[PDB]
Amino acid sequence: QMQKEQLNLMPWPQNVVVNDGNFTLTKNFKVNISGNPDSRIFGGVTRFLRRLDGRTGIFFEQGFITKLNEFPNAELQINCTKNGKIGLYEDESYSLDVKANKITINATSDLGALHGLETLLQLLQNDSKKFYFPVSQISDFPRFTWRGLMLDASRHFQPVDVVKRNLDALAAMKMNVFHWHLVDDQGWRIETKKHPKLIELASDGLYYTQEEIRNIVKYADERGILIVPEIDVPGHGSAILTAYPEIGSKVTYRIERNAGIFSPTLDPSNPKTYKILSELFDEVCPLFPGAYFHIGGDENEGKDWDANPKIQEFKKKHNLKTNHELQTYFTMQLAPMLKKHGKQLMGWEEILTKDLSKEAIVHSWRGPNEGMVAGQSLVDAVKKGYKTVLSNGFYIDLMYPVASHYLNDPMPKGADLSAEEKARILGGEATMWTELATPETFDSRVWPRTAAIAERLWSAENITDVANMRKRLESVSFRLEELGLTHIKNKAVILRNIANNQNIKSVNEFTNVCEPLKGYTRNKGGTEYQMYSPFTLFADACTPDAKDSLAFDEAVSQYLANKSADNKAKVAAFFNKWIAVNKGLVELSANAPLVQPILPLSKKLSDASQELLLVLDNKSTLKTADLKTLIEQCNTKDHADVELSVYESLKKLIA
Amino acid sequence: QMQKEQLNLMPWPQNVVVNDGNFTLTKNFKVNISGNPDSRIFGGVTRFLRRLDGRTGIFFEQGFITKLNEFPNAELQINCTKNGKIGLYEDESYSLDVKANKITINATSDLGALHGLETLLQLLQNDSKKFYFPVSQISDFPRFTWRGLMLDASRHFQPVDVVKRNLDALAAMKMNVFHWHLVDDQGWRIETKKHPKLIELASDGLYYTQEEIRNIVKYADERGILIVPEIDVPGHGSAILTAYPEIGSKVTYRIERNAGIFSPTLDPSNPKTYKILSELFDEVCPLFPGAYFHIGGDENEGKDWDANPKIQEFKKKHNLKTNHELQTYFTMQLAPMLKKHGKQLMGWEEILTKDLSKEAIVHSWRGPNEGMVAGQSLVDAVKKGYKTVLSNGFYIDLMYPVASHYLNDPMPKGADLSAEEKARILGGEATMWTELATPETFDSRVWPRTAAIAERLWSAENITDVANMRKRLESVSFRLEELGLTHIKNKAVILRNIANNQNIKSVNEFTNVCEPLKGYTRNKGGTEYQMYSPFTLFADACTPDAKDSLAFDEAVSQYLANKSADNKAKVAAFFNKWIAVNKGLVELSANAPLVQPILPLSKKLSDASQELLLVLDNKSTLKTADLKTLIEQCNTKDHADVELSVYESLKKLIA
């Protein structure tokens, strides 16, 4: 009897139907595995069972699942026809049939089966006493084969625990690529015995060991996820060149502590540049069994190359007119090195000029922030014959609203793309750059917006209803906590800190109408926060799509469409709430200096709120211009590196 | 202007004087290090600065601290005379002097300076706008040299991240020993490349690699902490004997899934037992540079030994009359293996019979729960000539109230110990056995109670005021969150699971009158929870010393002593609160099956509250016997494996 609309599935599967009846979860529940899956199925099914029991408190009979055919008559049957392989273009499909007395997952391989377990967890329903799954059939497959997250380990190092729990969350959202950005101006993160200066002098002692790398590779593979390592060259060179100044381009270098674009760049005319990289690949490539190796290539601004007559001579010698042509030549010297290791080369879009091999994968990243049209570099690459991954429009570090990411589609509008051109669009990847995210705040930035991205990368192109997505995301986000994700819980840590461990109610309520400044406006010029600055302040507790701002927006829209007393009260209750919040924050501040920065903002919201209560009763006597100004105070960006995201709805009310 | 009574220092230092004025923290703040410390001082000073900045939001100038005399006029000067060594009997003393314009830490070595940095953090004060340190002089040192936490990694495996943050917490509390219980019936946790069957067959894939162990030893050493590894033999042998059944004693074995005392025991008559153990020490001892190696020895109940005719002949051959004599013989066969690696032998008190070398350290653990007198095995061991560590009365896993641990003293009363005998009491150790703690709930069990234990092990013997200790503990527990400790934050995760992500307010308030069942009554017989059961339920969100219970108790005591209007109203406020909590839980339960187990308990409290409100106003007409039954309902242990810790005070109100 329940409506499909009540299911909180994400990604929304390709095919879904619900019918009368339920499967009831009891202490009899057991799982069986049949066919010929890869052994990764066993840990996956064990974890599934642990997670289901964590949610239900049943105390299932089974402990570790390790063999096929453990329980031929079990209530959950999982059938895999063959062994899955880690990589692109694998058959990731499955079907999930819930009947009144038995649940069946069928998949081409363990890959699909692991996906089906995630759908089955999302299907769990309950009443006041019991848990159940609705009788139903789901059949499913991904829209795109490359569905990724990039983790920047350079800006702020992200320890093994962060990486492991994020691999779990990727799996939970049916994401299958983890792109590991392991070097940038702010540090080198790969243990290297052949080139120990990179650890000694370019890491601060923060890095992944080779063994930890191998073990993370295995942890990902167990969970169906490919790792794509990145050594970004020849731009972003500050840390490499701290170790090896002799291959720099400037006619000296240090680990960079600020954010931004820097000048240190490897010298493509120096044979030593190529020898050192070749030796790096010999040591690093065997750690990563995936077929793809990302060599970066973003943001070389070219100034040291332009000034260096030796480089200018090299350009002339090779008939290379532009720095990008020189950088493609450089990249093409790396290609056979990677080929010797069995790897295909991938790079940020700047690598694409005429002589780039069509075997290279182009990582499309530039858009309006860079003066370009969103997606255009992708259109251009696939029309020229390159397989491409889209990250533009998925820059989750910039703290944009979830809808901006959810609606960003790897397949361009227009383009009159051929089918062959369409098939070169591998997928998409959210990019978590870490200038402004510590291990503590990382998850709060990645999740839950990356779950909405996961839906765009897996689900049908026409799954685009933002309100519906939001409704489903709430439970998705919640259930990620069982994997150790910190997005909700670490916020309370920060709030306790700011409030000197007084009652955090008011400061928590105030976060729910505040959002960190977006784009490149929090860390202005890159010099306001260093890579060792404290991220334990109010902006670090705030996220986009602030819960009470979204609720207030909805209340205000409903009200303005039908100005009923019930709808008006729903609005007015926010205002009374915010007046109380402000008083609570002033009280807290008497023993908490870290509340000081937000007091001007809560005062402005409280002042507006007070007047808007009179507006709603047509009892306000401020002059139009003074009412406009009062509300305008709430659009200030000057306090605590956050903004009030109720401002637009305050403006809609004042007429 | 502070008074010493307002300072939240823990352990309370040996000498504390507060004088007039404050040092004000500003953006000019810097640190300088002088003298001849061990290099561990550099990371410790860097983490200090990072932590201080996180609390204050100042954005200090210095990033990483890496050399001596970086800023010779810095506001904070740290002078160390010599290099500290990891081990026992080090001089861990320091002085900390805060003047209006300058702060100095002077210490014999970096070990004392590391401690002083923790005291300095605890001295941080603020008003509404600024942070400061009171002008004061502290000179300090520990009462005992062995101030330890034991972590059981066998019952529930505790990943690297758990171990690392707990090492930070130990340093924060000036604790200097981490005892790692790396094997038990429920799993073997040491990567062994030469005895791979222990990983393959006895670990479920859950273990620390050798490189992880070496890097945890380093992490600990950097923080002034000794690691003491334990391979527990010959009892608790289930997992060892799953890999090597041929050295068992029964005339077949599996990794144990339940809690309890089990029969599988190594065979001390079999030459292969000593061969395998000698090989294991050859592989494992090099991983742990500390001078002490724990061989366990607890709870061999001796049944397989008694039954085995070969072991009986062996006892006749060696004139060993008792199992304990035979086990001491076995233990003394290991003593030269350990000494060959430069290690001294430690074991649980069972190892002590007459022929145990007086160079063995005796770990005193038995008391009234084992039918013994608390502390007596320690008294006996030091009188006989053996150095001893007290763990009896520091069994934090059993969920006893903090005061039982805080008042437990490694120095026995009325034993007329000699000075030589006193000096054999090395110190004490909190033991976190993990039958009933996952990596998620581990910190909620350890902290903050182990912080009170830290004070017992460091501070003077006469610092015993429980109420003052509780007052100081609140901020100590809060500040541990900056080190990643999950004791507070993971509780909300559990409450969201229980509430189905509804508003957790009522369930959180109900945790504040409930405590998990104590002793050996939560997992009755060891068979109610397995090592893979779900620890995501109400008992897992509750802790001893529930805050509203303690407040209630105080309000009831004050009222019965002085039945003033105001006092009566303080008592009544709890009853009105509990009525509201029960309503909230009933509301939640409509969509949250995991609330069902607590409803009977919250209804029992609400019912008592309703009647006692009438009692307090003499509007009650219930008969004495019926009022008594009504309150007695609240002493039930049958719901959710918790108890209402307001019951005793309810009973006092109606006596």
Numbering used by the authors:
A (entry chain B), B (entry chain A): 1 to 251, 270 to 673
Mind quoting what the paper says about this structure?
No culturable Bacteroidete has yet conclusively been shown to deconstruct cellulose via the actions of a PUL7, but we recently identified and characterized a chitin utilization locus (ChiUL) from the aerobic soil bacterium Flavobacterium johnsoniae. The F. johnsoniae ChiUL consists of 11 genes: two SusC/D-like pairs for oligosaccharide capture and transport, an inner membrane transporter, a two-component sensor/regulator pair, and four enzymes. Here we present the crystal structures of the FjChiB chitinase and the FjGH20 chitobiase, as well as a small-angle X-ray scattering (SAXS) envelope of the novel FjChiA_M domain.
The fourth enzyme, the FjGH20 chitobiase/N-acetylglucosaminidase, was active only on CHOs. Thus, to illuminate these features we pursued structural determination of the FjGH20 by X-ray crystallography and were able to solve the protein structure from diffraction data extending to 1.70 Å resolution. The crystallographic asymmetric unit contained two protein molecules whose interaction gives rise to a buried surface area of ~ 11%, as determined by PISA21. Analysis of the protein in solution by size exclusion chromatography was consistent with a monomer unit being the prominent species (≥ 80%) and thus the dimer observed in the crystal structure is likely not of biological relevance. Each protomer consists of three domains: a central domain (residues 145–502) composed of a (β/α)8 TIM-barrel, an N-terminal domain (residues 1–144) comprising a six-stranded β-sheet and two α-helices where the helices are sandwiched between the β-sheet and the central domain, and a C-terminal domain (residues 504–673) consisting of an eight-helix bundle with two short β-strands. Several of the active site residues shown to be important for substrate binding and catalysis in GH20 members are conserved in FjGH20, including the H-x-G-G-D-E motif where a glutamic acid (Glu317) is proposed to act as a general acid/base in the reaction. The FjGH20 substrate-binding pocket is distinct in one significant way compared to the archetypical GH20 from S. marcescens (SmGH20)20,25 in that FjGH20 lacks the extended loop that is located between β-strand 7 and α-helix 7 in SmGH20. Interestingly, a portion of a loop extending from the FjGH20 helical bundle domain wraps around, and closes off, one side of the active site cleft in the TIM barrel with a tyrosine residue (Tyr538) that projects its sidechain into a position similar to the Trp685 residue in SmGH20. The FjGH20 C-terminal helical bundle is a distinct domain amongst structurally determined GH20 family members.
